[PDB]
Design a protein around this ligand. Structure first.
Ligand SMILES: *[C@@H]1O[C@H](CO[C@@H]2O[C@@H](C)[C@@H](O)[C@@H](O)[C@@H]2O)[C@@H](O[C@@H]2O[C@H](CO)[C@@H](O)[C@H](O)[C@H]2NC(C)=O)[C@H](O[C@@H]2O[C@@H](C)[C@@H](O)[C@@H](O)[C@@H]2O)[C@H]1NC(C)=O
Ligand SMILES: [Ca+2]
Length: 372
C-alpha cells in the first residue's frame, strides 16, 4: 500500500547516476606472454587495464574510444588464454546523469567488435536483455527485458510460482559472457520487490503470459544498460529484421565451456492469419484458433536448440523510427521457436500495452523510459 510514495519520493523512474554508489593484484602474478625479444616479459591483462595505443599496463581503468578494437572470441585464437585479455607491456572523471533513450542497439558492440563468431551478439548489443536467476535448467530461470530503470518485463510462467518466495530469485542486467567478469562494464543485480502477474494468465492455454518485476532499487546508468521501447496497443509488426536473444538455461553460468556469450538470431514477422493457417496445417487441425494474445515469427530450417530464453523479448525495429527497437513478443516456451514451415509462437506484447501502462501508473512509475 506504500509502493507509490517510495517510487515517487525515491525517484524510482530514473537510473541511479554512475559513481554515486576487485584489484588485479601484483602484476607479476599475472600470466606471462610475448614472443621474440619480449618472450615471457609481457603480461596477459584484462583489456581495460592496457592502453590501446601504448600497449602498456595502466594505473587505472581506461576506455578505448577509437572504435577500432576487434576481438576474436574463439578459444586458442589469441596470445592470451582469455579473449578478453591483451598481451600488455609492463609499466577517472565520473559523469552525471545523462539523457536516456529506449531501444538503442549497439550494432558494432561496446568497447570492441567481435570476430570468429557464429550466433554471438556483440558486447552490449541489446542493453535491455535481462536474466532472471536463482538467488539461492540450473541458474537461469528465464529471460526478460528492461522497460524502466526499476522494471523488468517477462512471462508470467516465469515467476508465477515465486509470488510468495521472491527472495529465491533475482535479476541480472548488463550481462554478456556469463563465464567471465572481465567485461569493462559489469552486470548489475537487483532483488525483486514485487511481481505483477496479469489477471487473466492461464498456465494451460498460455494466454496472457506476461508479468512485471518491480526491482528494490533502480539500475545504475551505464552503456551496457538500457530499456526497450514498447509498442502501441494493438500495434502489428511487419519486419524481416526482428531478433530473439538468449544464453540457454543449461549453458548460463555453466563452467564447463570456454564461454557463454549472449546469442542472437534474426527472424521475420509472420502475419497472424497466415500463422494460424500454418498451425492448422499441422496435426492441430483446421479448427485450431490462434488466440489474439499470441503473435508469430519465422522459425529455423534444420532445428536443434532455440535462441531466446523463456520470458525473453522478441524485438523489432520501430517502423516510425527504424534506428531503435520495440518489443513485439515474449518467449512463451523456450522450445517453441518453430521451424522452416511452422512459425514460432510468442506472447503478443502490443496486446498488453494498456495493461502495462496502467500497472506502472498505479505504482507511481513513469512510462517515459519505454517511450522516449
Ligand atoms: C529526486 O530527484 C530530485 C530531482 O533531481 C533532479 O532532476 C532529475 C530529473 C535529475 O536530473 C537529477 O540529477 C536532478 O538533481 C532531487 O532534487 C534535486 O536534488 C538536487 C541535489 O541532489 C538539487 O540540487 C535540486 O535542487 C533538487 N531539485 C528539486 C528541488 O527537485 C531529489 O533530491 C532530494 O530532494 C531535493 C529537494 C534535495 O533536498 C536533495 O538534497 C535531496 O537529495 C531526489 N530525491 C532523492 C531521494 O534523491
Ligand atoms: Ca560477464
Amino acid at each position: 500500500g506504500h509502493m507509490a510514495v517510495v517510487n515517487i519520493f525515491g525517484n524510482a523512474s530514473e537510473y541511479i547516476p554512475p559513481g554515486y554508489e576487485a584489484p588485479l593484484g601484483a602484476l607479476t602474478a599475472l600470466p606471462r606472454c610475448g614472443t621474440g625479444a619480449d618472450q615471457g616479459k609481457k603480461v596477459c591483462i584484462v583489456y581495460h587495464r592496457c592502453d590501446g595505443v601504448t600497449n602498456t599496463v595502466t594505473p587505472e581503468e581506461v576506455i578505448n574510444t577509437t572504435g577500432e578494437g576487434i576481438f576474436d572470441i574463439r578459444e586458442n585464437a589469441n596470445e592470451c588464454e582469455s579473449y578478453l585479455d591483451v598481451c600488455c607491456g609492463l609499466p577517472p572523471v565520473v559523469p552525471v546523469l545523462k539523457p536516456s533513450f529506449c531501444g538503442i542497439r549497439n550494432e558494432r558492440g561496446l568497447d570492441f567488435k567481435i570476430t570468429g563468431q557464429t550466433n554471438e551478439a556483440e558486447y552490449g548489443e541489446f542493453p535491455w536483455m535481462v536474466a532472471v536467476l536463482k538467488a539461492n535448467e540450473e541458474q537461469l530461470v528465464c529471460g526478460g527485458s528492461l522497460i524502466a530503470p526499476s522494471v523488468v518485463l517477462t512471462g508470467a510462467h516465469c515467476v508465477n510460482s515465486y509470488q510468495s518466495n521472491l527472495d529465491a530469485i533475482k535479476i541480472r542486467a548488463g550481462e554478456w559472457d556469463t563465464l567471465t567478469e572481465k567485461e569493462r562494464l559489469p552486470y548489475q543485480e537487483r532483488k525483486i520487490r514485487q511481481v505483477i502477474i496479469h489477471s487473466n494468465f492461464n498456465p494451460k492455454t498460455v494466454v496472457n503470459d506476461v508479468a512485471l518485476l518491480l526491482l528494490d532499487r533502480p539500475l545504475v546508468q551505464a552503456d551496457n544498460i538500457g530499456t526497450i521501447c514498447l509498442p502501441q496497443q494493438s500495434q502489428i509488426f511487419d519486419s524481416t529484421e526482428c531478433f530473439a536473444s538468449g544464453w540457454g538455461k543449461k549453458e548460463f553460468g555453466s563452467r564447463h565451456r570456454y564461454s557463454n556469450i549472449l546469442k542472437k538470431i534474426q527472424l521475420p514477422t509472420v502475419d497472424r492469419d497466415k500463422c494460424q493457417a500454418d498451425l492448422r496445417n499441422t496435426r492441430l487441425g483446421l479448427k485450431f484458433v490462434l488466440d489474439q494474445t499470441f503473435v508469430c515469427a519465422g522459425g529455423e530450417q534444420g532445428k536443434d536448440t532455440c535462441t531466446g530464453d523463456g520470458g525473453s523479448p522478441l524485438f523489432c525495429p520501430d517502423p516510425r523510427n527504424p534506428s531503435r527497437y520495440m518489443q513485439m513478443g515474449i518467449v512463451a516456451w523456450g522450445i517453441g521457436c518453430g521451424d522452416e514451415n511452422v512459425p514460432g509462437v510468442y506472447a503478443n506484447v502490443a496486446h498488453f500495452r494498456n495493461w502495462i501502462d496502467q500497472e506502472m501508473q498505479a505504482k507511481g512509475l513513469s512510462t517515459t523510459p519505454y517511450v522516449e
